[PDB]
A paper describes a structure:
One such Rab15 effector is [name], which is known to have a role in receptor recycling from the endocytic recycling compartment but otherwise remains poorly characterized. Biochemical validation of the interactions is presented and crystal structures of the [name]:Rab3B and [name]:[name] complexes provide additional mechanistic insight. We find that [name] adopts a globular structure that is distinct from other reported Rab15, Rab3 and Rab34 effectors. Detailed biochemical studies reveal that [name] is selective for Rab15, Rab3 paralogs and Rab34 and does not bind to other evolutionarily similar Rab [name].
The structure is composed of one [name]:Rab3CGppNHp_Q222H_10-227 complex per asymmetric unit. The structure of [name]:[name] reveals that, unlike most Rab effectors, [name] is a single domain globular protein which presumably explains why the other three deletion [name] constructs were not soluble. No electron density was observed for the first 14 amino acids, the middle 117 to 130 amino acids and for the last residue. No electron density was observed for the first 16 amino acids and the last 30 amino acids of Rab3CGppNHP_Q222H_10-227 (bovine). [name] is composed of 7α-helices and 7β-strands. The central core is made by the β-strands which are flanked by the α-helices. Similar to all known Rab:effector complexes, switch I, switch II and the interswitch regions of [name] are at the interface with the effector. They interact with the α3 and α4 helices of [name], constituting the primary binding site, with a second site being composed of a loop (residues 115 to 145), ß2 and β3 of [name]. α3 of [name] interacts with the switch I and interswitch regions, while α4 and β3 interact with the switch II region of [name]. Analysis of the interface by PDBePISA40 revealed that the [name]:[name] complex has a total buried interface of 843.4 Å2. The hydrophobic patch is composed of switch I (V63 and I65), interswitch residues (F67 and W84) and switch II residues (Y92, I95 and Y99) that interact with the hydrophobic side chains of L88Rep15, F89Rep15 from α3 and F151Rep15, L154Rep15 and I155Rep15 from α4.
Numbering used by the authors:
A (entry chain B): 26 to 197
B (entry chain A): 15 to 116, 131 to 235
The structure:
Amino acid sequence: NFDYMFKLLIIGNSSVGKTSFLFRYADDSFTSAFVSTVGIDFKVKTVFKNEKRIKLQIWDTAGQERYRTITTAYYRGAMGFILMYDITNEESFNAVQDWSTQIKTYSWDNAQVILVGNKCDMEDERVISTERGQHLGEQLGFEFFETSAKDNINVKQTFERLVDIICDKMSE
Amino acid sequence: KEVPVVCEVVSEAIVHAAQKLKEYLGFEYPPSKLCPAANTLNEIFLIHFITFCQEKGVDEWLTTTKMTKHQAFLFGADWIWTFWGSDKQIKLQLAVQTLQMSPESRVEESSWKKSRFDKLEEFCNLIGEDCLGLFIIFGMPGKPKDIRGVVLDSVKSQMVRSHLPGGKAVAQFVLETEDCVFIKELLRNCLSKKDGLREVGKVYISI
Ligand SMILES: Nc1nc2c(ncn2[C@@H]2O[C@H](COP(=O)(O)OP(=O)(O)NP(=O)(O)O)[C@@H](O)[C@H]2O)c(=O)[nH]1
Ligand SMILES: [Mg+2]
């Protein structure tokens, strides 16, 4: 009772908000208790586009380098990626290029990517500007969003844009 | 370097949790249901273990992660113990799968008909050299309250000559092996330097 199934992966450095992002999209909730993800996990969610029923299998990956090998082992079959950095963390933004090459390496076939700078509620602690993020997105050929899982800003928009551009491809 | 204190506390916590768990092993109610759920046994054990460790103040060096349902399916592990060094780096991870010895539902058709044993093996391979698979058996044929342990590598050595699938090979290991090693000595050997991986040999873990 679904017309399509899209595999999406949320990747990026530790602490950028990946689990929080998925938790907000899938359960409409948020928690401040940081608990680091071991390995990988997933949730599922059904959406509708042009009368079509789409099952999203959204995988939440671990950002710690110790879990690189396992997380990249689950890239296979990915149709979509959310590459997340933290607008208050310079390191997480610097790592975006590496994350992009990892997407290209372990997911050679063309998967759509959205670049997401999370924690945009934290305006006082911003170190990455919005235009820096969208320029990096333009450089990599990715759509760009600034988001807050805490305040539920541009979460639904990110996932729905991902579904849109996945559906625009495969329509040939 | 406080290796001995955490080693001692964790081994005693395992023994304590096993003693608390023994009350629930062997329960069978014919008029309704003949087993407590595996999750229930796991949760009782983990609660007693974690409380013991908390009362002994080792939470800075040991973290217990209970796998979600999805994670238990994917990894073949029911929980993971992570040991931290004074440099706040990971020294050792124990991926633990429990057995009795007397599923996914959110995945479309893939090649996930692999057994729990092989999924644990693959998980430990993917994590790396300092991750050890460990089986804990709650109950034996004729000894429902007996709790026993086996390291994954020992089972591998046994199947080299015995040619059985992993799941059955663990049971035959705990049924044929009479030599044992106490959990404390194992804990010491895997933490002073990561040696226990290809060291334990033809023993089970006495709890
Ligand atoms: N202000 C703010 N904090 C956020 C936001 N999203 C997550 N956080 C906080 O950032 C911390 C890390 O969140 P978490 O989702 O676990 O990040 P992660 O990417 O999953 N870490 P890991 O890769 O180790 O699993 C938590 O304290 C969480 O509350 C956000 O949009 N705004
Ligand atoms: Mg996480």
